[PDB]
Design a protein around this motif. Sequence first.
Motif, PDB file in Angstrom:
ATOM      1  N   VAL A 285       0.863  -1.261   0.027  1.00 22.96           N
ATOM      2  CA  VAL A 285       0.015  -0.027  -0.091  1.00 22.96           C
ATOM      3  C   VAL A 285       0.977   1.364  -0.026  1.00 22.96           C
ATOM      4  O   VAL A 285       1.712   1.319   0.899  1.00 22.96           O
ATOM      5  CB  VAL A 285      -1.095  -0.065   1.392  1.00 22.96           C
ATOM      6  CG1 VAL A 285      -1.871   1.374   1.202  1.00 22.96           C
ATOM      7  CG2 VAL A 285      -1.702  -1.279   1.129  1.00 22.96           C
ATOM      8  N   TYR A 286       0.696   2.071  -0.925  1.00 23.46           N
ATOM      9  CA  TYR A 286       1.524   3.357  -1.080  1.00 23.46           C
ATOM     10  C   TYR A 286       0.712   4.574  -1.215  1.00 23.46           C
ATOM     11  O   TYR A 286      -0.274   4.788  -1.958  1.00 23.46           O
ATOM     12  CB  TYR A 286       2.152   3.200  -2.532  1.00 23.46           C
ATOM     13  CG  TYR A 286       3.186   2.168  -2.614  1.00 23.46           C
ATOM     14  CD1 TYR A 286       2.803   0.865  -3.121  1.00 23.46           C
ATOM     15  CD2 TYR A 286       4.626   2.388  -2.524  1.00 23.46           C
ATOM     16  CE1 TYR A 286       3.501  -0.021  -3.342  1.00 23.46           C
ATOM     17  CE2 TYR A 286       5.464   1.400  -2.768  1.00 23.46           C
ATOM     18  CZ  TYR A 286       5.006   0.245  -3.158  1.00 23.46           C
ATOM     19  OH  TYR A 286       5.974  -0.891  -3.408  1.00 23.46           O
ATOM     20  N   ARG A 299       8.022   6.421  -5.607  1.00 24.58           N
ATOM     21  CA  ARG A 299       7.738   5.115  -4.971  1.00 24.58           C
ATOM     22  C   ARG A 299       6.596   4.354  -5.679  1.00 24.58           C
ATOM     23  O   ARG A 299       6.528   3.013  -5.466  1.00 24.58           O
ATOM     24  CB  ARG A 299       7.959   4.981  -3.664  1.00 24.58           C
ATOM     25  CG  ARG A 299       9.238   5.154  -3.009  1.00 24.58           C
ATOM     26  CD  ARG A 299       9.868   3.981  -2.313  1.00 24.58           C
ATOM     27  NE  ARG A 299       9.076   3.809  -1.010  1.00 24.58           N
ATOM     28  CZ  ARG A 299       9.047   2.459  -0.516  1.00 24.58           C
ATOM     29  NH1 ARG A 299       9.502   1.591  -0.746  1.00 24.58           N
ATOM     30  NH2 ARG A 299       8.616   2.454   0.863  1.00 24.58           N
TER      31      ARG A 299
END
Length: 703
Positions: A285-286, A299
Amino acid sequence: ATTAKQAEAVEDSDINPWTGQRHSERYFKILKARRKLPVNKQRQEFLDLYHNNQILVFVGETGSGKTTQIPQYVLYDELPHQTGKLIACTQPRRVAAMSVAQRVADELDVKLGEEVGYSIRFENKTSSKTLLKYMTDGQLLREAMHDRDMSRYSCIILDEAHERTLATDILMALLKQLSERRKDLKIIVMSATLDAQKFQSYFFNAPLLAVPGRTHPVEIFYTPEAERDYVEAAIRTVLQIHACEPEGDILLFLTGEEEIEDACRRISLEVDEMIRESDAGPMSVYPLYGTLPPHQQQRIFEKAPQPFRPGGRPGRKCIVATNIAETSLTIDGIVYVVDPGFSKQKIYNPRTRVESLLVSPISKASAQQRAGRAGRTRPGKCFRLYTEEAFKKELIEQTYPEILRSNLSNTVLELKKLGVEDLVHFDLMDPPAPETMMRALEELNYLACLDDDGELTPLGNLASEFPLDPALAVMLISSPEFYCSNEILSITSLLSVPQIWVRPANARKRADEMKAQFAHPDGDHLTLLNAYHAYKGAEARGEDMKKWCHEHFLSYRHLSSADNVRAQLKKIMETHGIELVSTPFHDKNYYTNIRRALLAGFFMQVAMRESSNSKVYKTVKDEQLVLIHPSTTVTTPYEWVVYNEFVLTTKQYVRTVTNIRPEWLLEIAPVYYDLSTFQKGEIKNALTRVAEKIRRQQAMKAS
Ligand SMILES: Nc1ncnc2c1ncn2[C@@H]1O[C@H](COP(=O)(O)OP(=O)(O)O)[C@@H](O)[C@H]1O
Ligand code: BEF
Ligand SMILES: [Cl-]
Ligand SMILES: [Cl-]
Ligand SMILES: [Cl-]
Ligand SMILES: [Cl-]
Ligand SMILES: [Mg+2]
């Protein structure tokens, strides 16, 4: 003169024509893929138009190849002319400019920073070799401030022009002007979600190139019924996709940093549950939002985790982002988009002159862009967390232009810095009403930010350096002359954000009690100051400030915002050599200094009591009859007051009020309160009597 065919023959060469190096195999794989894009089908048609028109409007589906292919077409077409100029392409966000610049560098088989580069605030990834530059609107505008003819560029491509941001609109106006000056400048305006005829008509009836076709489909899904908690619905949707759907990464759009971090936490916990209980695959999860460092924002591009086992449920990546990821981006691997339909959008309160952010429904164009984050490298799906009828009937077509939702005096100062001379007739695509512009110009002239010729003054120039309403900027700049620049720094910061007072209907008494602790009998500005001082004092003790704010019925959001703003303003003052001063608290003049200092910015927001027989006041500006707002801490309002806000409800009030002396008006704003030319009336009469009292007093003492 060079056709699409000749250019393609050059692209097929073993040798890179831009560097002299051998073309790599990756280059050819990418080229092979590129030539299947929709826009390619009309390359020649583009070139023709490009050759025969100074400005053109280009529309094509998301993912059709506008941003990556068109600037390369132009590149192959332009540089035999030996101009030594660049091609610029503007993206809304920095991460987009960087990402697409890297991609196009790959497509041209060159090093990023060399023949292809990017330019953003704080980072100029370009060099002498650079021929094509991706940048933000803001960056190009900042360059335009020093180079009005934009002499470094032969072609400017305004991408995502449908986003009516301040920078975009100003850029379009400046470029429309410049196109008449420079016939050797080309302009391309493009988007997938554009009001084509509006933009054509605006740019002197420019031609349109419309490219049909999608690289891949995006299936749109709606909910059968409305659902208030869009965060819970979003989380549920993400989890269901991970549990049931085939391989493919997820892009979820939320509205802000805090919401996104909370959502990420919850999603991750639930995912852990699903993993240990139901053999679900892993999911990374970003978070993604603007205050993240750009290279940390990058990222979001790393690969999803592998399955836990051969034949296992797919590993997956979930990006939880603001509309920072709404346009431009190709995130390869994304298959699912989740669209709750909301974003933080700017609003402008004209009575308080405050710009803030409000969670609001997105436009149809935004929904289409969001969905268009999928269907780029493979088929996609978009889950809109609202009904099809809500899309078709409740969402506006395009988001309202930011220039019409912003502080216009600020914008005017910026335009003056950009070299704009006639603001009344400045040809914006959607201009403010003539009266609004005239009001801004009037106010700025009275504030001495513009001279009587309408030209920028040194004071105006300095004021424009502050992220403030110009009146506040002038107040702050002037504060050292009143020996209270620290306190005015604080108060300016507080006046730049919405009201900090919280007063729930079910706890108003308690709220009032807490407010009583900060109340200053001579002014609401001083009460504000006290609240902020108490906030910082509690913070210094190491207290939980969300808790403290809750228990004192103050807005943690707005106080925190104001604190950050104060830091920025302090930095700017120090940069431009403005003194940071404080008078000892027990000095007889401590409060009178601050109360006086308010008038450097707000001498035009002053009211005079009509009679001792009544509580009605008359405003100096436009002679309005008002009452002092009942929320004031001023227990006995003076005959003269300064106020922050005109309030129109059941009655007319002035809110955020501080007691002043009338002689201060004559001292601090002598040009505005020039009695020889001031409007006739009871206010002029009162001021005349004040002046005559001072004169009589001085003549007597002199005798
Ligand atoms: N970074 C990337 N990785 C993989 N493929 C990409 C990348 N960028 C672009 N593409 C491919 O090129 C197509 C065109 O992208 P782009 O020119 O950004 O389209 P548009 O600007 O019209 O949305 C994409 O749909 C995708 O297929
Ligand atoms: F129109 Be694309 F998605 F930049
Ligand atoms: Cl950005
Ligand atoms: Cl930038
Ligand atoms: Cl992670
Ligand atoms: Cl953001
Ligand atoms: Mg694009």
